[PDB]
Each structure stands twice: as C-alpha cells, then as structure tokens.
Amino acid sequence: MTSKGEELFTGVVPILVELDGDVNGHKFSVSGEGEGDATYGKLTLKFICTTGKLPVPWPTLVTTLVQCFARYPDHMKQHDFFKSAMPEGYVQERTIFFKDDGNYKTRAEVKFEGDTLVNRIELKGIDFKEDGNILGHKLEYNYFSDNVYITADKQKNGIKANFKIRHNIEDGGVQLADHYQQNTPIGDGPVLLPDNHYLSTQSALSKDPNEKRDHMVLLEFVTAAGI
Ligand SMILES: [K+]
C-alpha cells in the first residue's frame, strides 16, 4: 500500500469526536461516537450536546464534526493525504462563512488515540444575527451533499480545500456556508501530497427515537473523485 497510515483503515475503526464551541458568546459542547469504514467511505456517528440545548443548528456543525475515512479508488491511492498522516494525525482548520451572517472558525486535531480515531475541535463563531438562520434555528434538518475541492499545499507539507454547502431554510431558500480549509500533518513522517481532486460527500441526518438529549445521528458517505 502506498502509505503506512492507509493500512489502519482496512477494517471498521472506532471514532470519538469532542467539540467545544462559542458562537456570539453562546457556549456549547458536543460529544460524538461511532465508527468508520473507509473501504466503503462510510461513517455512522451519533452526537450529543453535552451542555443541554445546542444554540446553533445541528446541520451547521456536520462538516466540523474525519475525511481520513474517504474511499479512495485504486487509481487514486497516491492522492490520500489524510490517511498518509496517520497515526500521528493532522490539524484541520477552517473558516466557514455563512452568507449574510456570521462565520465559524475551527481548529481540530485528528489522530489515533490507542485504536480510536479521535477528532478534537475548538470552534469560535462571531458576527451572527441573533435572529438569522443560524441563531434563530431556521434550517431544515435532513440531508445535504457536496464536493470538497482539494489541492496540495507543498509549502506547508499539506493540503487546502474549499467548498460550498447549501443548507435548506425551512419555507425558504438556502443558507450558504462557504468553507475554506487547511490541513497539516502533526508528525514528521512522509505524507502524500495530492493532485487536484474532490471528495463527493453525502450527509444524512436523523434522530434516535430513544434519545431524550439534544442530539444528531449522522450517516455519511465520502468518496474521492475527479481524477
Ligand atoms: K435547526
């Protein structure tokens, strides 16, 4: 196999996610668990707002809350930066601009802790409208899909990406979220820097009928393409 970290994703891998957030001074934490099967590009995750009521819409946190689980086709194995940085991991940073509203700034570490792939994230949101689509909770909760456009960032021994999410507004149009992303390896080992390509990602959101806490169940597929 073309990286050593690739070998860690051949079977089902357990996942943990920990997020601390602050959006316009509304603080919150989210804890997630589940598993990923990179063979199929398949993620099954469940998140709990551990601070009680989430002050932003669940759909707006999906992209922040493990692209190492992408399915790369055989012909594209040399373009998988994410697995190549494992097990030491990578830093993933974003700015997410919500059109006509505020932005999220995120910093995460994605790495193995024992046998578990752990995503630890700090999120800060500023300049939101208290009655806009985000803090006013005006988004639909269901499904979204888009493409993550990835390019190499050789100067940082990593990658960049950008993409746009169209979040449906309930009885409305969409709320756009323009994402800009950077990833850099945590370790000193060699990594794979890719040619331009994209991750086709579909995120289906649901509720656990036995869960009384504020929560999100996510079923997601992530597939590399474009080469
Ligand atoms: K909502």
mmCIF file of C-alpha atoms and ligand atoms in Angstrom:
data_model
loop_
_atom_site.group_PDB
_atom_site.id
_atom_site.type_symbol
_atom_site.label_atom_id
_atom_site.label_comp_id
_atom_site.label_asym_id
_atom_site.label_seq_id
_atom_site.Cartn_x
_atom_site.Cartn_y
_atom_site.Cartn_z
ATOM 1 C CA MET A 1 0.000 0.000 0.000
ATOM 2 C CA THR A 2 1.252 3.490 -0.832
ATOM 3 C CA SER A 3 1.260 4.838 2.750
ATOM 4 C CA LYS A 4 1.614 3.098 6.062
ATOM 5 C CA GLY A 5 -1.365 5.000 7.557
ATOM 6 C CA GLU A 6 -3.572 3.592 4.806
ATOM 7 C CA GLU A 7 -3.251 0.169 6.426
ATOM 8 C CA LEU A 8 -5.073 1.473 9.574
ATOM 9 C CA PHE A 9 -8.273 1.948 7.600
ATOM 10 C CA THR A 10 -8.778 -1.503 6.053
ATOM 11 C CA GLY A 11 -11.460 -2.501 8.582
ATOM 12 C CA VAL A 12 -14.045 -0.813 10.813
ATOM 13 C CA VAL A 13 -12.377 1.837 13.024
ATOM 14 C CA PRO A 14 -13.973 3.332 16.148
ATOM 15 C CA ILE A 15 -14.356 7.092 16.276
ATOM 16 C CA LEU A 16 -14.685 9.697 19.033
ATOM 17 C CA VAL A 17 -15.457 13.418 18.450
ATOM 18 C CA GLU A 18 -15.157 16.209 21.029
ATOM 19 C CA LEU A 19 -16.112 19.770 20.195
ATOM 20 C CA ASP A 20 -16.059 22.930 22.371
ATOM 21 C CA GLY A 21 -17.824 25.866 20.810
ATOM 22 C CA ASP A 22 -18.624 29.535 21.410
ATOM 23 C CA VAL A 23 -20.894 31.328 18.897
ATOM 24 C CA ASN A 24 -21.567 35.008 19.748
ATOM 25 C CA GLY A 25 -20.933 34.054 23.438
ATOM 26 C CA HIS A 26 -23.351 31.136 23.326
ATOM 27 C CA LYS A 27 -21.172 28.318 24.574
ATOM 28 C CA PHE A 28 -21.688 24.617 23.980
ATOM 29 C CA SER A 29 -20.007 21.207 23.843
ATOM 30 C CA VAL A 30 -20.740 18.206 21.700
ATOM 31 C CA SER A 31 -19.519 14.611 22.176
ATOM 32 C CA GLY A 32 -19.766 12.050 19.377
ATOM 33 C CA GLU A 33 -19.084 8.352 18.883
ATOM 34 C CA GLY A 34 -19.449 5.767 16.213
ATOM 35 C CA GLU A 35 -17.378 4.171 13.540
ATOM 36 C CA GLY A 36 -15.944 4.499 10.071
ATOM 37 C CA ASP A 37 -15.335 2.026 7.279
ATOM 38 C CA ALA A 38 -13.078 3.684 4.699
ATOM 39 C CA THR A 39 -13.435 0.691 2.346
ATOM 40 C CA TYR A 40 -16.955 1.973 1.676
ATOM 41 C CA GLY A 41 -16.271 5.623 2.610
ATOM 42 C CA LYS A 42 -18.939 5.095 5.290
ATOM 43 C CA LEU A 43 -19.376 6.905 8.600
ATOM 44 C CA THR A 44 -22.012 6.200 11.235
ATOM 45 C CA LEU A 45 -21.943 8.660 14.069
ATOM 46 C CA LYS A 46 -24.105 9.887 16.920
ATOM 47 C CA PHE A 47 -23.577 13.253 18.607
ATOM 48 C CA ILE A 48 -24.864 14.597 21.931
ATOM 49 C CA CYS A 49 -24.954 18.263 23.009
ATOM 50 C CA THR A 50 -23.429 17.695 26.465
ATOM 51 C CA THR A 51 -24.237 21.308 27.599
ATOM 52 C CA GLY A 52 -28.016 20.807 27.105
ATOM 53 C CA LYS A 53 -29.588 22.780 24.236
ATOM 54 C CA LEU A 54 -27.438 23.402 21.121
ATOM 55 C CA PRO A 55 -27.538 27.150 20.307
ATOM 56 C CA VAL A 56 -26.894 26.606 16.586
ATOM 57 C CA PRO A 57 -28.480 24.197 14.091
ATOM 58 C CA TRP A 58 -27.067 20.672 14.011
ATOM 59 C CA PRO A 59 -26.680 20.836 10.244
ATOM 60 C CA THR A 60 -24.245 23.715 10.572
ATOM 61 C CA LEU A 61 -21.850 21.544 12.645
ATOM 62 C CA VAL A 62 -21.796 18.462 10.454
ATOM 63 C CA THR A 63 -18.738 19.455 8.398
ATOM 64 C CA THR A 64 -16.781 20.394 11.534
ATOM 65 C CA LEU A 65 -17.626 17.208 13.495
ATOM 66 C CA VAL A 66 -12.814 12.848 9.677
ATOM 67 C CA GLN A 67 -12.008 12.872 5.991
ATOM 68 C CA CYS A 68 -9.465 10.111 6.608
ATOM 69 C CA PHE A 69 -12.458 7.806 6.175
ATOM 70 C CA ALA A 70 -12.884 8.653 2.479
ATOM 71 C CA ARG A 71 -12.955 5.871 -0.027
ATOM 72 C CA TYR A 72 -10.193 6.474 -2.498
ATOM 73 C CA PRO A 73 -10.411 4.492 -5.715
ATOM 74 C CA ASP A 74 -7.430 2.197 -6.509
ATOM 75 C CA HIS A 75 -6.205 4.567 -9.216
ATOM 76 C CA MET A 76 -6.281 7.495 -6.766
ATOM 77 C CA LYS A 77 -4.448 5.927 -3.743
ATOM 78 C CA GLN A 78 -1.473 8.311 -4.068
ATOM 79 C CA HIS A 79 -3.729 11.323 -3.502
ATOM 80 C CA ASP A 80 -4.892 10.380 0.008
ATOM 81 C CA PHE A 81 -3.106 12.853 2.228
ATOM 82 C CA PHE A 82 -5.432 12.164 5.159
ATOM 83 C CA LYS A 83 -4.571 8.513 5.773
ATOM 84 C CA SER A 84 -0.913 9.134 4.978
ATOM 85 C CA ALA A 85 -0.613 11.471 8.015
ATOM 86 C CA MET A 86 -1.868 8.695 10.333
ATOM 87 C CA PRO A 87 -1.410 7.564 13.042
ATOM 88 C CA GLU A 88 0.184 10.828 14.290
ATOM 89 C CA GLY A 89 -2.609 12.740 12.567
ATOM 90 C CA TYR A 90 -3.321 16.133 11.133
ATOM 91 C CA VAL A 91 -4.521 19.572 12.110
ATOM 92 C CA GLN A 92 -7.667 20.631 10.229
ATOM 93 C CA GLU A 93 -8.528 24.363 10.261
ATOM 94 C CA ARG A 94 -11.456 26.137 8.644
ATOM 95 C CA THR A 95 -13.157 29.427 8.226
ATOM 96 C CA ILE A 96 -16.826 28.930 7.387
ATOM 97 C CA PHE A 97 -18.624 31.999 6.066
ATOM 98 C CA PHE A 98 -22.366 31.963 6.352
ATOM 99 C CA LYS A 99 -23.619 34.246 3.650
ATOM 100 C CA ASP A 100 -25.218 37.464 5.052
ATOM 101 C CA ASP A 101 -24.422 36.216 8.546
ATOM 102 C CA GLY A 102 -21.511 35.334 10.794
ATOM 103 C CA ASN A 103 -18.590 32.932 10.464
ATOM 104 C CA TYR A 104 -17.206 29.894 12.236
ATOM 105 C CA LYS A 105 -13.502 29.457 12.797
ATOM 106 C CA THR A 106 -12.459 25.932 13.658
ATOM 107 C CA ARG A 107 -9.256 24.216 14.733
ATOM 108 C CA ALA A 108 -9.119 20.452 15.112
ATOM 109 C CA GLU A 109 -6.679 17.608 15.640
ATOM 110 C CA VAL A 110 -7.497 14.287 14.021
ATOM 111 C CA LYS A 111 -5.353 11.380 15.204
ATOM 112 C CA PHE A 112 -5.306 7.895 16.690
ATOM 113 C CA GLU A 113 -5.556 7.655 20.471
ATOM 114 C CA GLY A 114 -4.987 3.969 21.069
ATOM 115 C CA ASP A 115 -7.149 2.107 18.480
ATOM 116 C CA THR A 116 -9.644 5.012 18.162
ATOM 117 C CA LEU A 117 -9.662 7.781 15.599
ATOM 118 C CA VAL A 118 -10.343 10.954 17.603
ATOM 119 C CA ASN A 119 -11.382 14.345 16.248
ATOM 120 C CA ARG A 120 -10.878 17.164 18.839
ATOM 121 C CA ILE A 121 -12.202 20.560 17.830
ATOM 122 C CA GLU A 122 -12.408 24.172 19.073
ATOM 123 C CA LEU A 123 -14.983 26.329 17.331
ATOM 124 C CA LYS A 124 -15.500 30.094 17.580
ATOM 125 C CA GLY A 125 -18.394 31.887 15.914
ATOM 126 C CA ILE A 126 -18.718 35.676 15.627
ATOM 127 C CA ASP A 127 -20.886 38.338 13.949
ATOM 128 C CA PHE A 128 -24.043 36.250 13.822
ATOM 129 C CA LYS A 129 -27.514 37.719 13.756
ATOM 130 C CA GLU A 130 -29.372 36.590 16.884
ATOM 131 C CA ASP A 131 -32.500 36.226 14.687
ATOM 132 C CA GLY A 132 -30.753 34.989 11.494
ATOM 133 C CA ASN A 133 -30.948 31.450 10.111
ATOM 134 C CA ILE A 134 -28.322 30.066 12.456
ATOM 135 C CA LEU A 135 -29.036 31.528 15.929
ATOM 136 C CA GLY A 136 -32.770 31.713 15.052
ATOM 137 C CA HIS A 137 -32.824 27.965 14.213
ATOM 138 C CA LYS A 138 -34.418 28.360 10.739
ATOM 139 C CA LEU A 139 -32.716 25.472 8.933
ATOM 140 C CA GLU A 140 -34.142 22.169 7.784
ATOM 141 C CA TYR A 141 -32.817 19.047 9.419
ATOM 142 C CA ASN A 142 -32.449 16.255 6.783
ATOM 143 C CA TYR A 143 -29.722 15.881 4.182
ATOM 144 C CA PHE A 144 -27.054 17.714 2.257
ATOM 145 C CA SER A 145 -24.432 16.819 -0.288
ATOM 146 C CA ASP A 146 -21.490 18.499 -1.983
ATOM 147 C CA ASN A 147 -17.906 18.268 -3.226
ATOM 148 C CA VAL A 148 -14.760 19.119 -1.316
ATOM 149 C CA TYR A 149 -12.181 20.556 -3.769
ATOM 150 C CA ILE A 150 -8.689 19.643 -2.619
ATOM 151 C CA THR A 151 -5.345 20.970 -3.747
ATOM 152 C CA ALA A 152 -1.791 20.440 -2.484
ATOM 153 C CA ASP A 153 -0.136 22.968 -0.197
ATOM 154 C CA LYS A 154 3.534 21.974 -0.652
ATOM 155 C CA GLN A 155 4.856 24.960 1.358
ATOM 156 C CA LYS A 156 3.090 23.530 4.448
ATOM 157 C CA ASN A 157 3.544 19.848 3.538
ATOM 158 C CA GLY A 158 -0.264 19.570 3.482
ATOM 159 C CA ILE A 159 -3.427 20.421 1.634
ATOM 160 C CA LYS A 160 -6.100 23.031 1.176
ATOM 161 C CA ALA A 161 -9.682 22.714 0.270
ATOM 162 C CA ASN A 162 -12.768 24.744 -0.321
ATOM 163 C CA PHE A 163 -16.408 24.054 -0.850
ATOM 164 C CA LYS A 164 -19.900 25.494 -0.547
ATOM 165 C CA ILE A 165 -22.817 23.947 1.391
ATOM 166 C CA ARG A 166 -26.386 24.894 0.540
ATOM 167 C CA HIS A 167 -28.324 24.455 3.843
ATOM 168 C CA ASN A 168 -32.085 24.452 3.161
ATOM 169 C CA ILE A 169 -34.044 27.096 5.095
ATOM 170 C CA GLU A 170 -37.396 25.717 6.297
ATOM 171 C CA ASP A 171 -40.013 27.544 3.982
ATOM 172 C CA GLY A 172 -37.182 29.422 2.379
ATOM 173 C CA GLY A 173 -34.247 29.083 0.058
ATOM 174 C CA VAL A 174 -30.823 28.167 1.221
ATOM 175 C CA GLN A 175 -28.286 29.423 3.664
ATOM 176 C CA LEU A 176 -24.861 29.204 2.009
ATOM 177 C CA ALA A 177 -21.827 28.204 4.041
ATOM 178 C CA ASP A 178 -18.567 28.822 2.177
ATOM 179 C CA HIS A 179 -15.811 26.678 3.629
ATOM 180 C CA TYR A 180 -12.051 27.254 3.379
ATOM 181 C CA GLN A 181 -9.886 24.504 4.767
ATOM 182 C CA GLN A 182 -6.257 23.721 5.522
ATOM 183 C CA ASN A 183 -4.707 20.521 6.750
ATOM 184 C CA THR A 184 -1.155 19.942 8.003
ATOM 185 C CA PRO A 185 0.491 16.815 9.354
ATOM 186 C CA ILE A 186 1.127 16.596 13.116
ATOM 187 C CA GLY A 187 4.070 14.232 12.661
ATOM 188 C CA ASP A 188 7.387 14.417 10.872
ATOM 189 C CA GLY A 189 6.910 11.300 8.711
ATOM 190 C CA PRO A 190 6.377 11.492 4.924
ATOM 191 C CA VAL A 191 2.902 12.302 3.623
ATOM 192 C CA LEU A 192 1.262 12.053 0.261
ATOM 193 C CA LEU A 193 0.593 15.368 -1.442
ATOM 194 C CA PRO A 194 -2.236 15.079 -3.969
ATOM 195 C CA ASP A 195 -3.062 16.220 -7.421
ATOM 196 C CA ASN A 196 -6.284 18.282 -7.582
ATOM 197 C CA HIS A 197 -9.351 16.143 -6.886
ATOM 198 C CA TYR A 198 -12.538 16.203 -4.792
ATOM 199 C CA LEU A 199 -14.386 14.309 -2.117
ATOM 200 C CA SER A 200 -18.042 13.711 -3.024
ATOM 201 C CA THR A 201 -19.812 13.750 0.353
ATOM 202 C CA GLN A 202 -23.452 12.910 1.312
ATOM 203 C CA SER A 203 -24.621 13.543 4.866
ATOM 204 C CA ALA A 204 -27.979 12.128 6.084
ATOM 205 C CA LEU A 205 -29.203 13.405 9.433
ATOM 206 C CA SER A 206 -31.746 11.648 11.686
ATOM 207 C CA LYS A 207 -32.892 11.290 15.286
ATOM 208 C CA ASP A 208 -32.597 8.352 17.677
ATOM 209 C CA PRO A 209 -36.241 7.833 18.894
ATOM 210 C CA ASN A 210 -34.940 6.634 22.320
ATOM 211 C CA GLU A 211 -32.707 9.663 22.907
ATOM 212 C CA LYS A 212 -34.141 12.440 25.050
ATOM 213 C CA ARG A 213 -30.970 14.620 24.905
ATOM 214 C CA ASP A 214 -30.369 17.164 22.100
ATOM 215 C CA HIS A 215 -28.540 15.025 19.514
ATOM 216 C CA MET A 216 -27.792 14.153 15.882
ATOM 217 C CA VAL A 217 -27.435 10.811 14.157
ATOM 218 C CA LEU A 218 -25.274 11.061 11.024
ATOM 219 C CA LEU A 219 -24.904 8.545 8.231
ATOM 220 C CA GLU A 220 -22.314 9.822 5.785
ATOM 221 C CA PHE A 221 -20.516 8.658 2.623
ATOM 222 C CA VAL A 222 -17.277 10.232 1.431
ATOM 223 C CA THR A 223 -15.784 9.212 -1.927
ATOM 224 C CA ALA A 224 -12.735 10.626 -3.687
ATOM 225 C CA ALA A 225 -13.158 11.502 -7.373
ATOM 226 C CA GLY A 226 -12.226 13.842 -10.143
ATOM 227 C CA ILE A 227 -9.099 12.132 -11.458
HETATM 228 K K K B 1 -32.420 23.728 13.160
#
